[PDB]
């Protein structure tokens, strides 16, 4: 025990020495944080809260300041309450203060609570009055409540309701009511943990309170600013509704919430409350179909369906997403796909009968509307969009330039690449096999995505201006070495931008290593991949190359752009007899043993042409790849010189590089374009 302070910071050793009179008066005019280690379990605090007479003194003093507080003076009610909250907290966690855990002791706070409630100043209004309510709600949270106490909250709820449009948007006002409700609910739920809810002092005695929550929940005229309040109303209507004699009446109000706000946030909550709090049984006594409700909700937000490639590529979209966009996205998928197969060298899906056999894209009208996707489909919506491979489904939304740096096409070009990685490159589950036991592909998965997003029809892969722009930052470190980028647990957001630079670097400056790397992933050769990463990491030379290549990108930024699909794709091409197109493409590409498939879409038809290409004597694999790129891009360009508009829709790739017994270069070649001949 001590009998001196120093510095307006107070120790328990010192507080323990004071008479109760002196103590309670001190607490009235100090902030709670001024008490040192207040929430800490000490011999000091043990001694302080261990005295049943002292805490009772603290309770009595709070009861007195509850009787006397005014709009201008709070009479330390905040401090009194924080001190008590500390009592109960330590009593919960530490034996020796366990008498503080007993609900029977906690009830000793009720007379103080009532005192606060009977004060004519127990109303929302000024900062003091509001803080008093906030403090009360938190104390109930740690202590106890009566049916009597709860019902005294009724005027405050009415006052809030009657002033919803002013009060709910106010942080302090809104926090007060929320703290009060949440506080009471926490105490009540705690007391009934595994006990029969029917045997509670307050059960059936809180009808006025419940009725006050119905009114909030079923307010109707919500805005963005006031929605949370009615949300609280519904959520806590369900919670307190448990202490009503009429179950079916409570569920009726919840079902009304669903009808009143539909496919908005509060209907989802109300619906959750029925299944979780009320056994998913309605007011009529029959099982509410939660699954149908979610299906109804998805149909409301995603009413439009667009089908491509014989139903293997489906877009479900909001009513406001442009049809032009839909088409552009399809053609964008085609551009990225052709570049991807070129580099990777495989177009045959790795597994049979996976969900990605059909690609599905769900595009909400807006970021606002997008949020209900987590509700509807159980996925995070804290993103610009998301590909879920086990579902073969991409979720995103249409967006304005102000809403996102990325347009919808760009984001799709990026995410689409993950669909390609998972289907055609990485065997088994994406993110969950041998290649993921160690953290080997983080740079690669994200880097190749940014990279392939820049695919074009006839120019290969180009850097996107936006990523080039990012690279324009601090040269002096901050810039990653080759070794750092390849070997990421946290890193700053720039990590992905350097991953891109590596991918681009390898593509432009070192195709041989790019191909070797992809073949390793493709063949599931974890050892070859690790060896390649090792050589690159250990070789200071490749790093210097990479460092200057970063500079080269930074320089290219001035005149760069975003590779996006051409308006040419949307043009009315008109008729062209199918057989002429095939012959024309076969001659110009020198294809052999060709075959074709025609596919039906929502707005057009398409064909896929497959042929063998065999050229002259091989100049090595990587030189072969380079020339094949140039020879093929050249064919696509010259074909566009023809009068038929449809050649401008063509995309092409090659796969399965090999050499003949006579060292002649040999590839599988694929062309894709619009088809305008029915027969």
Swiss-Prot record:
Keywords assigned by UniProt, alphabetized: Calcium, Hydrolase, Metal-binding, Metalloprotease, Pharmaceutical, Protease, Repeat, Secreted, Signal, Virulence, Zinc, Zymogen
Instruction: Please indicate which superkingdom the organism of origin belongs to.
Output: Bacteria
Q: Name one GO molecular function term.
A: calcium ion binding
Q: Where in the cell is it found?
A: Secreted
Q: How is its activity regulated?
A: Inhibited by 1-10-phenanthroline. Inhibited by peptidomimetic isoamyl-phosphonyl-Gly-Pro-Ala, which binds to Zn(2+). Inhibited by broad-spectrum zinc metalloprotease inhibitor batimastat. N-aryl mercaptoacetamide-based inhibitors have been isolated that act on clostridial collagenases with submicromolar affinity while having negligibile activity on human collagenases.
Region Helper subdomain, as annotated, extends over: 568-679
What is the role of the protein in this entry? Clostridial collagenases are among the most efficient degraders of eukaryotic collagen known; saprophytes use collagen as a carbon source while pathogens additionally digest collagen to aid in host colonization. Has both tripeptidylcarboxypeptidase on Gly-X-Y and endopeptidase activities; the endopeptidase cuts within the triple helix region of collagen while tripeptidylcarboxypeptidase successively digests the exposed ends, thus clostridial collagenases can digest large sections of collagen.
**Additional record remark:** Clostridial collagenases enable the bacteria to infiltrate and colonize host tissue, and contribute to gas gangrene (myonecrosis) pathogenesis.
Q: What is the designated name of this protein?
A: Collagenase ColG
Q: Which organism is it from?
A: Hathewaya histolytica (Clostridium histolyticum)
What gene name is listed for this protein?
colG
Segment of the intact protein contained: 119 to 790 of 1118
């Amino acid at each position: 025990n001590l009998y001196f302070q120093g510095g307006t910071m107070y120790d328990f050793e010192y507080l323990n020495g004071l008479s109760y009179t002196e103590l309670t008066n001190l607490i009235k005019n100090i902030k709670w944080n001024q008490i040192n280690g207040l929430f800490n379990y000490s011999t000091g605090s043990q001694k302080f809260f261990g005295d049943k007479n002292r805490v009772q003194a603290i309770i009595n003093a709070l009861q007195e300041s509850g009787r006397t507080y005014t709009a201008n003076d709070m009479k330390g009610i905040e401090t009194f309450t924080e001190v008590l909250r500390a009592g109960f907290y330590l009593g919960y966690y530490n034996d020796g203060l366990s008498y503080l855990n007993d609900r029977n002791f906690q009830d000793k706070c009720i007379p103080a609570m009532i005192a606060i409630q009977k004060n004519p100043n127990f109303k929302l209004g000024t900062a003091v009055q509001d803080e008093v309510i906030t403090s009360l709600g938190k104390l109930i949270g740690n202590a106890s409540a009566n049916a009597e106490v709860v019902n005294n909250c009724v005027p405050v709820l009415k006052q809030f309701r009657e002033n919803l449009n002013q009060y709910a948007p106010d942080y302090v006002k809104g926090t007060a009511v929320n703290e009060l409700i949440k506080g009471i609910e926490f105490d009540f739920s705690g007391a009934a943990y595994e006990k029969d809810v029917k045997t509670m002092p307050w059960y059936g005695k809180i009808d006025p309170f419940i009725n006050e929550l119905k009114a909030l929940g079923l307010y109707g005229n919500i805005t963005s600013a006031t929605e949370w309040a009615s949300d609280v109303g519904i959520y806590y209507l369900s919670k307190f509704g448990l202490y009503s004699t009429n179950r079916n009446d409570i569920v009726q109000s919840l079902e009304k919430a669903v009808d009143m706000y539909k496919y908005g946030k509060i209907a989802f909550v109300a619906m959750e409350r029925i299944t979780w709090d009320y056994d998913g049984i309605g007011s009529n006594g029959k099982k509410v179909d939660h699954d149908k409700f979610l299906d109804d909700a998805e149909k409301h937000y995603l009413p439009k369906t667009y089908t491509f490639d014989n139903g293997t590529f489906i877009i479900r979209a909001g009513d406001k997403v442009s049809e032009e966009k839909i088409k552009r996205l399809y053609w964008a998928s085609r551009e990225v796909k052709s570049q991807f197969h070129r580099v990777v060298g495989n177009d045959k899906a790795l597994e049979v009968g996976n969900a990605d056999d059909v690609l599905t894209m769900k595009i909400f009208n807006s970021p606002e509307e997008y949020k209900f996707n987590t509700n509807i489909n159980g996925v995070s919506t804290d993103n610009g969009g998301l590909y879920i491979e086990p579902r073969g489904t991409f979720y995103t939304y249409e967006r304005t330039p102000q809403q996102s740096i990325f347009s919808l096409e760009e984001l799709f070009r990026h995410e689409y690449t993950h669909y390609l990685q998972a289907r055609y490159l990485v065997d088994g589950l994406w993110g969950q096999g041998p290649f993921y036991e160690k953290n080997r592909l983080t740079w690669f998965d994200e880097g190749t995505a940014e990279f392939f997003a820049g695919s074009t029809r006839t120019s290969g892969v180009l850097p996107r201006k936006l990523i080039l722009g990012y690279l324009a930052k601090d040269k002096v470190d901050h810039r990653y070495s080759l070794k750092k980028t390849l070997n990421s647990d946290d890193s700053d957001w720039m990590f992905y931008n350097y991953g891109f630079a590596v991918a681009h670097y390898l593509y432009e400056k070192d195709m041989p290593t790019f191909i070797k790397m992809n073949k390793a992933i493709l063949n599931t050769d974890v050892k070859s991949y690790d060896e390649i990463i090792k050589k690159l990491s250990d070789d200071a030379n490749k790093n210097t190359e990479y460092q200057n290549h970063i500079q080269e990108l930074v320089d290219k930024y001035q005149g760069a752009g975003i590779p996006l699909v051409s308006d040419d794709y949307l043009k009315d091409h008109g008729y062209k007899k199918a057989s002429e197109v095939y012959s024309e493409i076969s001659k110009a590409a020198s294809l052999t043993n060709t075959s074709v498939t025609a596919e039906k879409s929502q707005y057009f038809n398409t064909f896929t042409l497959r042929g063998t290409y065999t050229g002259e004597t091989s100049k090595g694999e990587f030189k072969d790849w380079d020339e094949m790129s140039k020879k093929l891009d050249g064919t696509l360009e010259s074909l566009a010189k023809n009068s038929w508009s449809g050649y401008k829709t063509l995309t092409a790739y090659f796969t399965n590089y090999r050499v003949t017994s006579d060292n002649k270069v040999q590839y599988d070649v694929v062309f894709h374009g619009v088809l305008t001949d029915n027969g």
